[PDB]
């Protein structure tokens, strides 16, 4: 073996150079862009190697913490474009802090609860800010944020009776859901609805009638899932689709074989990170949307009695993903990002960290196997693959709400 | 009338025609979180938007105000919803609104609200005449814009405009054969017109795809389409394909070709093929080659496939 102060990396092996793009001497916009990213990434990788000396990689926890702590209270006008997504900012930041095991002061927690209460609509659901119409995306974010806080104060903010009525007000006869009244339809809505309904215990027999079938129609020839039937497979929509089906216990409605082959193919042989769709670029946020699909598929196949499943690893290159996130997605000033050259933002900070946690932790049944690349302190808290909040938070919230009746239903 | 960046722009709090209504500030609570330090202009427009919304004022001034609110944050879906309420209530010229959304999407093509607004207008007018050309212009700037392709599929299916889409697909594939959004549109068009059961159509597609593969052997999209149009009937149902790929292996031993062979072997074993032991041995050898040398990023997947094959066909 090697001394504790040097840790060989997959991305630094001499044979890794063979993984560079082969454009077959036929250049198109796609290959040109891919080659540009690979050139930059190789430069980054090389900066972490000093011949046979390869220092352990470090997650800059403290820098990330200070960036997050500041954002939770105030934001520059650069975030005016997210004025209709305030609950998302709460969730992204709180989940990042949770992954980093950084305590949330009680005062700050109460202030977040009060703010989300102001975003809650009298018709049920939460809007992007005080007085805004409710929308399933901020509703999903608000519920997740309240569950991360996990106090009875936070749980009780949610008006469950109106929330269920609101979900009914968005339900379509073909099984799909509108994102908001008079709004668009895509797989994101099914997941947002399934996530908040299961956590708050408001699922009725008919709420999701036809939903599983509609989601299956979104799986396409590629194996992944598109936003609506007929559309290109995309990691974001595929995560939403599979996670929703897992909540509904209808994963078998999909061709899991083609889905598995599709997502594993989305990990970039050279960069180590994941792309959102075939022939597009690597991006740190897909560390969650794409890689998060492996724990879901593992669970789904394990429920089916698959005798070939691993008892120690997810079906993606866990080490290579950690290498991509740690070497290429950290902003030296704190925060994480899409790829070198891009600026940090709270959204990428949330998902790059969520993906890193998934890559470090394997769990199935009574089996637990951790693979924490770099210094030991890099280990993050685990995240639930369905909800993307701590597993402890999921259990605590589900248990709390299971003690309440389904609004006006028996 | 006057844009937010125009030299003569005046804050709403200073407009005489707006003096009769009090602005409604946003209440973020006494101890704010994720508080955005808005510019004076941003806050001014939204304080008045909140006022007209709270009063549910269906007026021409409210309608013009939404235009500025949208310029400040086109992702504010509440503003868009209210603007649509006003369009109906004021009986606004929808063709003029179409010219408006056209300009807005050109500026912010990756926004969900703008594409949905356009769809609603097209639905209200039952007029798709400008759609294919407009979308084509958006795709000329970003050939992979997801929202544009989604809107394009909706228009084509809702108004049955299939006649020239395969020709459009062919042109875009000529420009960039690696454009996965275009291969997806190819499947979309064929499955919804002739279908793939017509053996003449299937042969044409398999031939076309194989030609693209020979031209650009490492383009994953073509390989994925080839598998996509053959997978449901079963890859083992096409014996000649195996031979052709086997002949191209010695000169094009790419991970895509090797993986495709494993996929064929998997299906063959699932269908009581002849020489089962030999096929299983060949598949396991390729899984090892993929895991250790040719496609190591997917070592865990290939090892799983190897174990899976043994659990299903060892005997």
């Amino acid at each position: 073996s090697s001394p504790v102060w040097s840790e060989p990396l997959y991305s630094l092996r001499p044979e890794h150079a063979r993984e560079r793009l082969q454009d077959d001497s036929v250049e198109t916009v796609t290959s040109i862009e891919q080659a540009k990213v690979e050139e930059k990434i190789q430069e980054v990788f090389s900066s972490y190697k000093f011949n046979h000396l390869v220092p352990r990689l470090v997650l800059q926890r403290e820098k990330h913490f200070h960036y997050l702590k500041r954002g939770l209270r105030q934001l520059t006008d650069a975030y005016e474009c997210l004025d209709a997504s305030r609950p998302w900012l709460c969730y992204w930041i709180l989940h990042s802090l949770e992954l980093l095991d950084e305590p949330i002061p009680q005062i700050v927690a109460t202030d977040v609860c009060q703010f989300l209460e102001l975003c809650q609509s009298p018709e049920g659901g939460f809007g992007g800010g005080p007085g805004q119409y409710p929308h399933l995306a901020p509703t999903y974010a608000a519920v997740n944020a309240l569950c991360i806080i996990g106090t009875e104060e936070a749980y009780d903010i949610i008006n469950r009776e109106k929330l269920l009525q609101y979900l009914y007000s968005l339900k379509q006869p073909d099984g799909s859901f509108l994102m908001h009244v008079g709004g668009e339809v895509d797989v994101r809505s099914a997941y947002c609805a399934a996530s908040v309904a299961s956590l708050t215990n408001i699922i009725t027999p008919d709420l999701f009638e036809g939903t599983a079938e509609w989601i299956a129609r979104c799986q396409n020839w590629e194996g992944g899932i598109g936003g609506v039937p007929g559309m290109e497979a995309h990691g974001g929509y595929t995560f939403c689709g599979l996670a929703a089906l897992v909540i509904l216990k209808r994963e078998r409605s999909l061709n899991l074989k083609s889905l598995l082959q599709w997502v594993t193919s989305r990990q970039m042989r050279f960069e180590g990170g994941f792309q959102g769709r075939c022939n597009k670029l690597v991006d740190g946020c897909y560390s969650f949307w794409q890689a998060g699909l492996l724990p879901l598929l593992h669970r789904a196949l394990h429920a089916q009695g698959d005798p070939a499943l691993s008892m120690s690893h997810w079906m993606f290159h866990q080490q290579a993903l950690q290498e991509y996130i740690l070497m290429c997605c950290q902003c030296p000033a704190g925060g994480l990002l899409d790829k070198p050259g891009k600026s940090r933002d709270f959204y990428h900070t949330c998902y790059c960290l969520s993906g890193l946690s998934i890559a470090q932790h394997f769990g199935s049944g009574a089996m637990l196997h951790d693979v924490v690349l770099g210094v030991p302190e890099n280990a993050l808290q685990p995240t639930h693959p369905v909800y993307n909040i701590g597993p402890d938070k999921v259990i605590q919230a589900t248990t709390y709400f299971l003690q309440k009746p389904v609004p006006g239903f028996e | 009338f006057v844009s937010l960046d125009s030299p003569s722009y005046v804050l709403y709090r200073d407009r005489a025609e707006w003096a009769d209504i009090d602005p409604v500030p946003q209440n973020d609570g006494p101890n704010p979180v994720v508080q955005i330090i808005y510019s004076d202009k941003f806050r001014d427009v939204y304080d008045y938007f909140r006022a007209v919304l709270q009063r549910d004022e269906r007026s021409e001034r409210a309608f013009k105000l939404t235009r500025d609110a949208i310029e400040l944050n086109a992702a504010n879906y509440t503003v868009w919803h209210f603007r649509r309420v006003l369009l109906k209530s004021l009986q606004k010229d929808l063709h003029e609104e179409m010219n408006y959304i056209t300009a807005i999407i050109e500026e912010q093509p990756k926004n969900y609200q703008v594409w949905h607004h356009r769809r609603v207008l097209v639905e209200w007018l039952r007029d798709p005449s400008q759609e294919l050309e407009f979308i084509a212009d958006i795709l000329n700037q970003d050939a992979k814009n997801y929202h544009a392709w989604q809107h394009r599929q909706w228009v084509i299916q809702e108004f049955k405009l299939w006649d020239n889409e395969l020709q459009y697909v062919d042109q875009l594939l000529k420009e960039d054969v690696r454009n996965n959004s275009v291969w997806n549109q190819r499947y979309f068009v064929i499955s919804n017109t002739t279908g793939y059961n017509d053996r003449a159509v299937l042969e044409r597609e398999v031939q076309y795809t194989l030609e693209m593969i020979k031209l650009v052997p490492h383009n994953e999209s073509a390989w994925n389409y080839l598998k996509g149009i053959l997978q449901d009937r079963g890859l083992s149902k096409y014996p000649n394909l195996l031979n052709q790929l086997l002949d191209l292996q010695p000169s094009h031993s790419s991970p895509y070709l090797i993986a495709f062979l494993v996929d064929i072997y998997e299906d063959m074993l699932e269908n009581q093929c002849d020489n089962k032991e030999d096929i299983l041995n060949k598949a396991l050898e390729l899984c090892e080659i993929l895991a250790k040398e040719k496609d190591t990023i997917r070592k865990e997947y290939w090892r799983y496939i190897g174990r899976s094959l043994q659990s299903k066909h060892s005997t």
Partner: peptide, 11 residues
């Protein structure tokens, strides 16, 4: 932070 230019909007 440049969330305005990022193509990663989920809403």
């Amino acid at each position: 932070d440049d969330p305005t230019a990022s193509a990663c909007n989920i809403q």
